[PDB]
């Protein structure tokens, strides 16, 4: 849900799940390349 829980993952961890392939990883890399830029942190905690 939302962003953060998605934003921290290594591409080596995300690359292997069904249906992603190499294309969708670069797709989310392009979409999330704007705004957040992040694709990682250890952060702190969560409000919800």
């Amino acid at each position: 849900h939302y962003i953060g829980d998605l934003v921290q993952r290594t591409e080596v961890e995300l690359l292997k799940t069904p249906n992603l392939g190499k294309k969708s990883l670069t797709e989310i890399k392009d979409v999330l390349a704007s705004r957040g830029l992040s694709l990682g942190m250890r952060l702190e905690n969560w409000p919800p």
């Binding site: 670069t26 797709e27 890399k29 392009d30 390349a33 704007s34 830029l37 992040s38 990682g40 942190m41």
Partner: protein, 316 residues
């Protein structure tokens, strides 16, 4: 040696240095860091120009690595400190600089995306027909354009050019009776004597070219080579190294040794009234020059007036 402030250096930071510093600190992969380092060198002291994209992609030597990977990475690089960085074409520069308006800007977000994304090529002259394209009227569009005109261009904030690179002059021309008189202000001894002779040749140039006249009277290096009997290349070298100083229009005098310069002055006079016609008529001016006796016939003398960032051609 050491224990003193030898001119060891400063290690300042340019824009590419700083961008690379900014890349060091962001969560790029092994490859993406190679694309990033590949883009930040492509960037210029002017910002906007990231030059050709497909050469960025092809420079990596295939093996996979599509266009989209450099595109995303490229966007994120475009997002680093000086707001709009790199990108291309200024359009996408203003779209990235416009990417963060906080979205709480009234009327600006939408209108600014329409104007800046597309049709901005016609916004150069004025609004006019564009007002009918976007259906906007009055100050609704004018305020958005106030924001677009309030953006600035690219980087050139990093800069790191504190050095103005001053002239320091070399020889002072104290102005006499509507002209100029030398004074030279401000082996090794033989080199100093040669520099003094170069100042003497500049004084001969005072006699070679009229100061008061438009531009400078046409002269040949054979005159200065006639006076002291020195070789042409030597005199041109002295005038090329040192820069003559005069109260008005001081210059290395290398350009001082009335020819094309008079035509440039005539072109400047034509430019003053050239404002009425955007296209301009250097060819017509060439016909006027031929009538004046110049005999210019749509020549580069007229073309030079039609060049040099003239309204001519560009307005057309």
């Amino acid at each position: 040696d050491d224990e003193l402030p030898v001119y060891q250096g400063e290690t300042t930071q340019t824009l590419q240095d700083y961008l690379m510093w900014q890349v060091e600190l962001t969560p790029f992969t092994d490859t993406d860091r190679a694309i990033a380092t590949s883009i930040v060198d492509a960037v210029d002291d002017t910002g906007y120009l990231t030059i050709q994209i497909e050469d960025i992609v092809d420079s990596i030597g295939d093996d996979e690595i599509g266009l989209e990977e450099v595109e995303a990475v490229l966007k994120r690089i475009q997002r680093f400190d000086p707001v709009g960085v790199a990108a291309k074409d200024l359009r996408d520069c203003l779209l990235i600089q416009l990417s963060q308006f906080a979205k709480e800007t009234p009327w600006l977000e939408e209108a600014r995306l329409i104007i800046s994304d597309h049709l901005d090529l016609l916004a150069n002259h004025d609004f006019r027909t564009l007002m009918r394209v976007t259906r906007l009227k009055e100050e609704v569009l004018k305020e958005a354009v106030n924001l677009i005109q309030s953006l600035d261009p690219r980087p050139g904030q990093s800069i790191q050019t504190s050095e103005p690179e001053y002239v320091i002059p070399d020889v002072l021309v104290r102005k006499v009776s509507g002209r100029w008189t030398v004074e030279l202000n401000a082996l090794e001894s033989r080199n100093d004597t040669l520099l003094r002779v170069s100042r003497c040749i500049v004084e001969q140039q005072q006699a070679f070219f009229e100061q008061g006249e438009e531009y400078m009277k046409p002269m040949v290096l054979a005159d200065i080579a006639q006076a002291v009997e020195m070789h042409e290349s030597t005199i041109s070298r002295v005038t090329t190294q040192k820069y003559l100083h005069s109260p008005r229009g001081i210059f290395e005098l290398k350009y001082f040794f009335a020819s094309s310069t008079a035509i440039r002055a005539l072109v400047k006079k034509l430019i003053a009234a050239e404002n009425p016609a955007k296209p301009l008529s250097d060819s017509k001016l060439t016909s006027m020059l031929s009538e004046q006796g110049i005999m210019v016939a749509r020549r580069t003398v007229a073309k030079y007036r039609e060049s040099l960032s003239i309204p001519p051609s560009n307005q057309r």
